[PDB]
């Protein structure tokens, strides 16, 4: 995956209302218990999913089983490890644990090690300090592959989408409840709010009707519409700014 | 003790925090080596996790902190074999084992 979450088009777990009276519903607590039950169970599953991985001619035949599960060791590195032909990651871990046993870092101070006899023999170098990066880079060179035979002579997304859609319908029904409840308590200063805001939103929707194709190619904007006053009064300003 | 008190707060850290060391870091893979037929850096959260784990290794007198810091070493030791910048970092933890 990425380093940041993926934006997506459809909603994802919108809220549950809390202002409904519990003397009538008495059920949102139970759905709440089910939701934190799901979150706890999902926490357990995600932790376990993370922790589950935590002339005479010769015969040359390249076999079926040329396989890097058991890779051949150089005999110097075989003497340093001890095993005959084990693996590559086992080799890296064994070399690093040998270095960690012999206390060679420092008693870059932890990058530089103290080169001893066998390790200089298996690296064919003669320094005293050499960083661990190059030491484990040489492991890639010191290992050779195994020799062949030689003879000479989902539905859960849609389900969660449905639960999200249903919770949105719950939000819609709760908002339509709360409107009529607040109108039921004090009706004066919500009907005045309606008569104000409906008028203002009608003016906002009717703020765009003189910008059509054939309403601007004609002449019934510029001439005789001092009733409108909005444009053709900017021309004292727009020429003075050089736009034209 | 308050942090490592719970059976689920002290147990997520046994699985995440060794895994957060090699977060978004090109570790040397071995699937290619099983199917032929090193990073030199760190990340932004690897430094923070190494800082937190070195500070957590300073819980002396064998309370609840070093009881965690001893049970994470056999798993972090495999992470140090892959990433050599985990040798300069994780230094006070390695001195505290």
């Amino acid at each position: 995956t990425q380093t940041n979450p993926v934006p997506v088009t459809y909603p994802t777990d919108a809220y549950i209302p809390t202002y409904l009276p519990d003397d009538k519903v008495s059920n949102l607590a139970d759905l709440k218990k089910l939701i934190e039950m799901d979150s706890r169970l999902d926490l357990y599953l995600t932790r376990r999913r993370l922790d589950t991985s935590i002339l005479r001619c010769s015969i040359t035949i390249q076999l079926r089983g040329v396989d890097g599960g058991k890779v051949q060791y150089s005999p110097n590195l075989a003497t340093l490890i001890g095993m005959q032909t084990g693996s590559v990651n086992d080799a890296v871990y064994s070399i690093y644990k040998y270095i960690l046993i012999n206390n060679l870092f420092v008693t870059p101070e932890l990058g530089e090690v103290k080169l001893d006899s066998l390790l200089q023999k298996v690296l064919d170098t003669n320094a005293a300090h050499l960083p661990l990066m190059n030491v484990v880079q040489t492991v890639n060179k010191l290992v050779s592959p195994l020799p062949p035979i030689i003879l000479d002579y989902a539905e859960d997304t849609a389900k969660l989408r449905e639960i999200t859609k249903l919770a949105l319908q719950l939000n819609s029904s709760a908002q339509k409840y709360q409107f009529f409840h607040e109108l039921s308590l004090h009706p004066r200063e919500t009907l005045t709010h309606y008569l104000w805001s409906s008028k203002q939103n009608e003016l906002v929707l009717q703020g765009d009707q003189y910008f059509n194709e054939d309403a601007a190619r004609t002449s019934d904007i510029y001439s005789n519409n001092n009733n409108d006053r909005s444009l053709m009064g900017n021309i004292s300003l727009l020429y003075s700014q050089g736009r034209l | 003790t308050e942090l490592f008190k719970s059976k689920e707060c002290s147990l997520i850290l046994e699985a995440t925090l060794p895994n957060l060391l090699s977060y978004n870091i090109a570790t040397p893979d071995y699937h290619l080596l099983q199917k032929h037929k090193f990073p030199q850096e760190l990340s932004d959260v690897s430094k923070v996790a190494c800082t937190f784990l070195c500070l957590l290794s300073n819980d002396t007198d064998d309370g609840a902190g070093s009881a965690f810091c001893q049970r994470i070493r056999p798993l972090v030791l495999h992470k140090l074999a892959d990433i050599p910048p985990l040798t300069l970092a994780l230094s006070e933890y390695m001195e505290n084992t």
Binding site: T79, L80, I81, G82, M83, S94, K97, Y98, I101 | -
Partner: peptide
């Protein structure tokens, strides 16, 4: 059981390295 596998396998690996360091003795006297 995950602990009692590792706490014996690491001692086995330490013994496998100490035996190589003792095989170092038997090739100096030859």
């Amino acid at each position: 059981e995950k602990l009692k596998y590792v706490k014996e396998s690491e001692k086995m690996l330490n013994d496998r390295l100490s035996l190589s360091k003792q095989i170092l003795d038997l090739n100096k006297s030859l």
